[PDB]
Amino acid sequence: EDQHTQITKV
């Protein structure tokens, strides 16, 4: 129910 999310490796 949401848009394309940002993914970051930490």
Add this chain to the structure above:
Amino acid sequence: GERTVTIRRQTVGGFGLSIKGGAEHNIPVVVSKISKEQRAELSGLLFIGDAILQINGINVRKCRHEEVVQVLRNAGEEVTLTVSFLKAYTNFDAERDALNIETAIKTKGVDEVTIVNILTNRSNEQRQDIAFAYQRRTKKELASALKSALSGHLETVILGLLKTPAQYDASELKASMKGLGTDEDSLIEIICSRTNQELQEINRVYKEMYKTDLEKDIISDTSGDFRKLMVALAKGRRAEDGSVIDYELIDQDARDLYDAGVKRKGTDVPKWISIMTERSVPHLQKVFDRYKSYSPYDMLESIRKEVKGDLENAFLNLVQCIQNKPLYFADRLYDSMKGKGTRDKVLIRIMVSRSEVDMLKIRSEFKRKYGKSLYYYIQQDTKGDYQKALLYLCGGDD
């Protein structure tokens, strides 16, 4: 349920987490990938889909995606998160489970993470199916392979989980009586808390496993009225829950418990044993409330005043099991962890034996009384894959 998780840097420049989303999409940031190394070293349970609420004591609930990235990149090697999921098996393949367990066993150094993730997230019935598929593929019994591959308290948990409920209880009973003394606490816990159908299956399997009967072992290890009470309970012939509430008998039993105890010198112990072993559990719950109409002390207070030693210990446990069995187990769990070290024997047995019975109620009574979740206490008292197995058996925070 808000879970607490402690992550540790696995690589120089990295915890091993792929963070996702943020306040851009109006949600808190969410974990989307966890390296196998992080899964093995973290404390707690971190799932894909956990929202990150706090980091090292700072509330990051309303932070954008890049704000929490800077926080974690400038944090030390060990970081504490407060998380919450953003709100058996469904595709159960016993053969695939057996294969993955074999691959985990045969991995150099043993892959405990995989063994725990599977076995503690299958029902006991599914574990039996996995064990059957495993013996076919490998020509080894699953329980033997894991007994060789594992050690410490993790071995105890996993091997406990692989037995049927009756086999597990029977072997726990045998262990409480084997050797010069008796582990009265464990004998009492099991005999006072199991129902007719459980005790009937325990009685049968005990004879198959040990070629002798439970009752003879109880008689050989206990004496006096303590023996009488344990023997009577273990027969598993308590009246089943009726549909009619017998109000006249409720009042008479309450009067009889009073007349046999607080009202007279000494105690009529056979009368206490008869009433408390024979009547159904819902009847006795009402008996114990009616008892307070006649007695200035409630049933637990009356027991402490009337009797001592093993007999007292047993009556106290029995009454708690009748009054509120989930709260009874919540208290034993708390006692197994509250102090120095851990009474692992007790903590393991409860988590294994109750995980499929009434763990939701245990967790609820536990959090209500003690304020923090059962998860939280297990996390403070245990570590490693053993901690992970118990937390999965727990089944979430709160």
